[PDB]
Amino acid sequence: APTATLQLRVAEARQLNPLIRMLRLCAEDGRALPGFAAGAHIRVQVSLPDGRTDWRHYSLINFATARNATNAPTEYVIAVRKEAEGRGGSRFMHEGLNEGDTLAIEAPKNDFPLHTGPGGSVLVAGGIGVTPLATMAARRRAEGAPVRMHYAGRSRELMAFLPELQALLGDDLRVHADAEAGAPLDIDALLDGVPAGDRLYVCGPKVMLDAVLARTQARGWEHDRVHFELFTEPVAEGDQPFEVELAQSGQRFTVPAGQSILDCLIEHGCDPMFDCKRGECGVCAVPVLEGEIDHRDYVLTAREKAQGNVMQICISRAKGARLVLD
Ligand SMILES: Cc1cc2nc3c(=O)[nH]c(=O)nc-3n(C[C@H](O)[C@H](O)[C@H](O)COP(=O)(O)O)c2cc1C
Ligand code: FES
Numbered sequence: 001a002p003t004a005t006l007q008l009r010v011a012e013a014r015q016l017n018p019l020i021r022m023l024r025l026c027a028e029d030g031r032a033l034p035g036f037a038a039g040a041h042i043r044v045q046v047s048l049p050d051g052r053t054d055w056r057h058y059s060l061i062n063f064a065t066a067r068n069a070t071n072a073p074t075e076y077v078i079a080v081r082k083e084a085e086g087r088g089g090s091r092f093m094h095e096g097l098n099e100g101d102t103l104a105i106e107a108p109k110n111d112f113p114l115h116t117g118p119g120g121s122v123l124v125a126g127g128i129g130v131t132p133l134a135t136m137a138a139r140r141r142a143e144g145a146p147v148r149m150h151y152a153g154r155s156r157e158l159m160a161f162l163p164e165l166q167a168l169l170g171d172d173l174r175v176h177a178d179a180e181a182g183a184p185l186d187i188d189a190l191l192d193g194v195p196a197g198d199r200l201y202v203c204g205p206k207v208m209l210d211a212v213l214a215r216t217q218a219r220g221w222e223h224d225r226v227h228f229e230l231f232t233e234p235v236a237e238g239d240q241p242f243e244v245e246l247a248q249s250g251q252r253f254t255v256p257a258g259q260s261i262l263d264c265l266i267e268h269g270c271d272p273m274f275d276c277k278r279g280e281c282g283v284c285a286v287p288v289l290e291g292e293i294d295h296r297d298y299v300l301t302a303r304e305k306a307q308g309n310v311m312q313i314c315i316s317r318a319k320g321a322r323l324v325l326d
Pocket of ligand 2: 273274275276277278279280281282283284285297299312313314315
């Protein structure tokens with residue numbers, strides 16, 4: 001049940017700007033690490049402010065355009081945005097980790113892969129959400145495949161990897177900075193510009209991913225045309241408690257405000273199906289017999305959400321005070 005881990009050394013730390021720190025991680029003896037495909041992340045072990053150990057996802061970064069670029073890597077590269085008001089994990093990555101330190105990680109996992117079907121690729125990055133999309137861009141360039149990146153942030157001063165991405169993509173990089181535009185990214189115009197059949201890869205904050213989801217579902221885009229990678233944690237936000245009644249056996253649990261339905265069930269004892277835990281994979285779907293749902297996933301169709309008979313319990317909640325689940 002414990003997940004396999006690697007003990008890596010911090011081979012380089014680089015302050016890209018005041019908020020974002022690049023870390024290069026190597027095996028102790030420089031041997032090859034598990035390979036990965038564009039979109040993969042690693043989970044890294046952090047110490048929280050009270051000394052509790054926990055795990056944090058960070059996407060793997062590569063700009064090299066050799067076709068073998070990430071098949072047998074000898075390093076993993078990540079970039080961490082410091083959240084001074086977060087839970088302490090990103091703070092640890094900035095303040096409690098030094099060059100030469102060792103760090104336990106879990107082997108790469110990929111919930112956000114590039115699609116090999118027909119069509120080019122349009123990448124939509126919000127802030128530090130650029131990290132797996134940079135690797136995606138590098139891979140499409142390695143393939144000679146059409147790719148465009150929309151990279152949006154509040155200020156250019158705080159957006160990482162602009163010189164690397166400009167060199168990699170040239171005119172196929174479109175940078176949006178709120179501080180220059182005076183307005184947020186125009187997602188409607190972005191979607192209008194996507195070439196017919198091209199697939200969309202959206203990574204970053206919940207508010208951006210939600211705006212893309214609403215519009216691509218309104219447009220009736222095919223379900224495998226749009227791909228989502230949600231960085232925002234915790235997914236259990238402002239949220240309220242609610243009752244869950246398990247219809248098979250009458251048990252009524254109270255889901256607290258800071259806990260997902262899935263985590264509440266996993267805790268109390270059941271064996272739910274799950275994987276990504278952030279609304280992307282679809283695996284945790286449960287039928288809903290009664291109660292209005294506040295849907296927060298990126299996998300159910302507009303029709304499925306409207307019918308009200310299924311939800312992703314890793315991320316979605318009750319609209320009211322009670323849900324009856326099968
Ligand atoms: C799949 C996945 C990939 C992520 N990749 C990054 C990343 O590359 N850089 C980053 O700053 N945060 C990334 N995040 C968000 C972090 O895991 C984490 O939530 C963030 O650093 C805040 O944690 P904290 O509140 O403990 O500081 C990712 C989250 C997920 C689920
Ligand atoms: S576990 Fe992936 S959608 Fe819930």
